[PDB]
């Protein structure tokens, strides 16, 4: 069933801000009371999220 | 319903682990000159100087 | 007093903050 | 080290060998019509030999 | 009958298994899943997150490892090494020595 | 005079990475009625397990 | 910094000797070992100076 529904209403897309969010553990290594520098794909701080 | 969509870019982060191994804080490297200084010094605190 | 240091020597020794075992490195 | 590994079940040269290898063709007299089968070459061994 | 053939490709169906008893308090060369080393393995009190497989201290040295069977954390410490020194009064007064 | 060094040798008592107990169920052709045929051959592949 | 310099390729396949030994045959596994030896000697000499 391709249904192909209808009755679509248009509004502009709204943006908002990323308040220090979107950080994941890059590896499976345990650390304790240390500062570690990593280089990988991340969501930048204070970006425009839809 | 409400939801938010963003994107990822290749960045460099400095991550802070507590005694129990969970990431409790992070700092970006290409946000501010202050963030650049923090990443260079590998610390979350900077003293007076150049 | 523990050891035989003076008041000022104790202050100096507690003021300075200080190491482990490595692969080939000894102290 | 050129392998041909069955020949290295048979005859092996060291890593720092110094000397000369000389080979030539013997299709005229080593192999001829009507049976030539008297050479054997040790298909496989238990382990590599020094 | 099967086909004995070779072709260059990243493996998808592949994995080893040897199994050996776990020995503590005796330094030895060890090979966990992928990670190899040498040292003495002892019980630990560190707490890992459920997805974490091995600890690591400053200067990137493997410090603790979780075993795949019991999911327990073990400390790795190298077994002893050092130097030896010979203390002599000179081979003009005597020939006996001490060793440190 | 510091003459030489000493170190403790391993006891050879080695360690593990066992428990294949995942044990994906794929054995049905091993003792089935028909294995294959000259013109009933499929694409026999093994993947996503051991 | 001396200890941290120990996990570096210096142009070799890896930074750990055991994997180089396991994944390569002795005739041509020696070049990687030589590169690692060269780099580690250089770092140690700089530390001493
Ligand atoms: C870490 O976990 C322990 C419980 O094992 C808890 O007592 C302690 O407060 C935790 N650390 C922090 C910083 O919350
Ligand atoms: C696999 O692991 C479980 C728990 O992780 C443990 O009972 C044992 O080591 C294995 N189970 C078997 C062999 O049934």
Query: This structure's resolution (angstroms)?
Result: 2.8
Check: CB of residue A12 under 8 Å from CB of residue B15: no
Planar angle of CA E53, E28, E17, nearest 5 degrees: 55
Backbone angles phi, psi at A37, to 5 degrees: -105, 125
- β pairing state of E36-43 and B23-28: unpaired
Binding site membership of F19 for ligand 2 (Cβ less than 6 Å): yes
Check: CB of residue E27 under 8 Å from CB of residue F11: yes
Check: CB of residue E78 under 8 Å from CB of residue C23: yes
CA max distance for chain B: 50
Identify residues after which chain G is interrupted (C–N over 2.5 A).
none
> How far is B5 from A50, CA to CA, in rounded Å?
5
F9, F14, F15: best to mutate for the E interface, most E CBs within 10 A: F15
Which is nearest to E67 in space by CA: E29, E25, E21, E13? E21
CA max distance for chain E: 83
B38, exposed or middle or buried, with CB in 10 Å at 0-12, 13-18, 19+? buried
Q: Give chain E positions within 8 Å (CB) of G17.
A: none
Check: CB of residue A36 under 8 Å from CB of residue B24: no
Which helix (H) or strand (E) segment holds residue E82: the answer is strand E81-87
8 Å CB contact of B20 and E47: yes
Q: Which of E69, E70, E71, E73 to mutate to test the pocket of ligand 2 (most atoms within 8 A of CB)?
A: E69
Check: CB of residue E48 under 8 Å from CB of residue E54: no
Which is nearest to A36 in space by CA: B41, B20, B11, B13? B13
**Residue G9 in tokens:** 């390729």
> How far is E67 from E21, CA to CA, in rounded Å?
11
> How far is A40 from A46, CA to CA, in rounded Å?
18
**DSSP state for residue G5 in the 8-state scheme:** G
Beta bridge partners of E82: F6
**DSSP state for residue B44 in the 8-state scheme:** S
> How far is E34 from F4, CA to CA, in rounded Å?
34
> How far is A35 from B15, CA to CA, in rounded Å?
6
- β pairing state of A29-30 and B9-17: unpaired
Instruction: Give CA separation, A29 vs B5, C19, C20, E53, E75, in Å.
Output: 29, 23, 21, 6, 14
- Cβ-based neighbours of E27, under 8 Å, separated by 6 or more: E38, E39, E40, E78, E79, F8, F10, F11
**Residue G46 in tokens:** 């700089």
> How far is E24 from E75, CA to CA, in rounded Å?
10
Check: CB of residue E40 under 8 Å from CB of residue E27: yes
Instruction: Give CA separation, B48 vs B28, B37, B45, G21, in Å.
Output: 21, 12, 10, 50
> How far is G37 from E79, CA to CA, in rounded Å?
24
Binding site membership of F9 for ligand 2 (Cβ less than 6 Å): no
Way the structure was solved: cryo-EM
Tell me which residue has tokens 């020794």. Answer: C13
Which is nearest to B22 in space by CA: A31, E56, A42? A31
Backbone angles phi, psi at G4, to 5 degrees: -70, -30
Check: CB of residue F47 under 8 Å from CB of residue E11: no
8 Å CB contact of G7 and E60: yes
Cα B20 to averaged position of ligand 1 atoms, centre (Å) = 6
> DSSP alpha helices (H): ranges in B1-50?
33-41
Check: CB of residue E35 under 8 Å from CB of residue E60: no
Half-sphere CA count of G35, side-chain side, radius 13 A: 15
> How far is A29 from A38, CA to CA, in rounded Å?
13
**Residue E22 in tokens:** 């776990």
Check: CB of residue E27 under 8 Å from CB of residue F10: yes
Could you identify the atom of ligand 1 that is nearest to the CA of residue B20? 1
Check: CB of residue G33 under 8 Å from CB of residue G16: no
> How far is G29 from D15, CA to CA, in rounded Å?
12
Interchain contact E/F (3 or more Cβ pairs less than 8 Å): yes
DSSP string, chain D: ----TTHHHH----TT--S-------TTTTS-SS--------S--SS---
Q: 3-state class of F19 per DSSP?
A: coil
> How far is G21 from G26, CA to CA, in rounded Å?
8
CA–CA min distance C23, chain G (Å): 9
Instruction: Give CA separation, E53 vs A37, B27, B31, E39, G43, in Å.
Output: 20, 25, 33, 18, 31
């Amino acid at each position: 069933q391709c249904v192909n529904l209808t009755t679509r209403t248009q509004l502009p897309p709204a943006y908002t801000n990323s308040f220090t969010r979107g950080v994941y553990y890059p590896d499976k290594v345990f650390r304790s009371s240390v500062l570690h520098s990593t280089q990988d794909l991340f969501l930048p701080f204070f970006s425009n999220v839809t | 319903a409400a939801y938010y969509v963003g994107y990822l870019q290749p960045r460099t982060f400095l991550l802070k682990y507590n005694e129990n191994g969970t990431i409790t804080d992070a700092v970006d490297c290409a946000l501010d000159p202050l963030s650049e200084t923090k990443c260079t010094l590998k610390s979350f605190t900077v003293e007076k100087g150049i | 007093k523990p050891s035989k240091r003076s008041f000022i020597e104790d202050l100096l020794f507690n003021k300075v903050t200080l190491a482990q075992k490595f692969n080939g490195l000894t102290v | 080290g050129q392998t041909g590994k069955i020949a290295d079940y048979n005859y092996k040269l060291p890593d720092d060998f110094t000397g000369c290898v000389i080979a030539w063709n013997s299709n005229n007299l080593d192999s001829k019509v009507g049976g030539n089968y008297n050479y054997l070459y040790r298909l496989f061994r238990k382990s590599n030999l020094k | 009958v099967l086909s004995f053939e070779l072709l260059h490709a990243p493996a998808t169906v592949c994995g080893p298994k040897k199994s050996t008893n776990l020995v503590k308090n005796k330094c030895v060369n060890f090979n966990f899943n992928g990670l190899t080393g040498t040292g003495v393995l002892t019980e630990s009190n560190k707490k890992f997150l459920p997805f974490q497989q091995f600890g690591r201290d400053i200067a990137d040295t493997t410090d603790a490892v979780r075993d795949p069977q019991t999911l327990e954390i073990l400390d790795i410490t190298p077994c002893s090494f050092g130097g030896v020194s010979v203390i002599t009064p000179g081979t003009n007064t005597s020939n006996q020595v001490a060793v440190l | 005079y510091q003459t030489s060094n000493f170190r403790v040798q391993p006891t050879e008592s080695i360690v593990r990475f066992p428990n294949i107990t995942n044990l994906c169920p794929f054995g049905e052709v091993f003792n089935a009625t028909r294995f294959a045929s000259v013109y009933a051959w499929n694409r026999k592949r093994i993947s996503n397990c051991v | 910094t001396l200890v941290k310099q120990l996990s570096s390729n210096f142009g070799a396949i890896s930074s750990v000797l055991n994997d180089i030994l396991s994944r390569l045959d002795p005739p041509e596994a020696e070049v990687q070992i030589d590169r690692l030896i060269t780099g580690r000697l250089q770092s140690l000499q700089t530390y001493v100076t």
